[PDB]
Amino acid sequence: EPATILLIDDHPMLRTGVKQLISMAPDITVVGEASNGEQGIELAESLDPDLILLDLNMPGMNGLETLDKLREKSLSGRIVVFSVSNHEEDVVTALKRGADGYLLKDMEPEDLLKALHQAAAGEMVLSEALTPVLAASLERDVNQLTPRERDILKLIAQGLPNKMIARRLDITESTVKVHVKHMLKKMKLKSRVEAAVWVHQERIF
């Protein structure tokens, strides 16, 4: 079963290249497409895909607001935003706001494929460079987690993809997804990257 991807954009040339690359990676696949944030946000919660690709440059000049609304939803997957902004601080703001990654729209095809496959199906840990930054941005009642939720949190913090977590814990990805949503909600962590940083600072494990 290939990893699931939801595309939220209003940039045809971008969608084309992304869908072209995805069609050449047997283990990752597009499960939905939305041309505006309102549509995509509702689709994200219902499909609960492994990866949600969000265009921060759609009509409205409100990419961050759309990231916020998306992030308010109960999701177990990763969120990677696309933007034409080269402002270094924008990568930091996206991460602080709930994105697990940030990509420019001008990447070489092979570099974009590697990024897409990693985001949807590979291990993903935040760079040492941005780590101190999200750390500072970061109440959490860890004892409210069930054993399984703690095991889920520990592996999520390792940057492991759902298939790898499902296997290590001998549970289906469906179950992994259910636990990830519950755990993030209880710990008040906005994202999987936020969970890896929290666990790291606290050394809860």
UniProtKB/Swiss-Prot annotation:
* Signal peptide coordinates: none
- Residues carrying 4-aspartylphosphate: 55
What species does this protein belong to? Shigella flexneri
* Ranges for domain HTH luxR-type: 139-203
Q: What is the lineage of its organism?
A: Bacteria, Pseudomonadati, Pseudomonadota, Gammaproteobacteria, Enterobacterales
Q: Name one Pfam family in it.
A: Response_reg
* NCBIfam families linked: PRK10651.1 (NF007935)
Q: Does the keyword Isomerase apply?
A: no
List, alphabetically, the PANTHER family matched: NITRATE_NITRITE RESPONSE REGULATOR PROTEIN NARL, TWO-COMPONENT RESPONSE REGULATOR
Claim: Transcription is one of the keywords in the record = yes
What task does this protein carry out? This protein activates the expression of the nitrate reductase (narGHJI) and formate dehydrogenase-N (fdnGHI) operons and represses the transcription of the fumarate reductase (frdABCD) operon in response to a nitrate/nitrite induction signal transmitted by either the NarX or NarQ proteins.
- What's any GO biological process attached to this entry? regulation of DNA-templated transcription
Which CDD domains did the record assign? LuxR_C_like, REC_NarL
**GO terms of molecular function:** ATP binding; DNA binding
Q: Which residues bind DNA?
A: 162-181
Question: Could you tell me what this protein is called?
Answer: Nitrate/nitrite response regulator protein NarL
What are the entry keywords? Activator, ATP-binding, DNA-binding, Nitrate assimilation, Nucleotide-binding, Phosphoprotein, Repressor, Transcription, Transcription regulation, Two-component regulatory system
Where on the tree of life does the source sit, at the highest rank? Bacteria
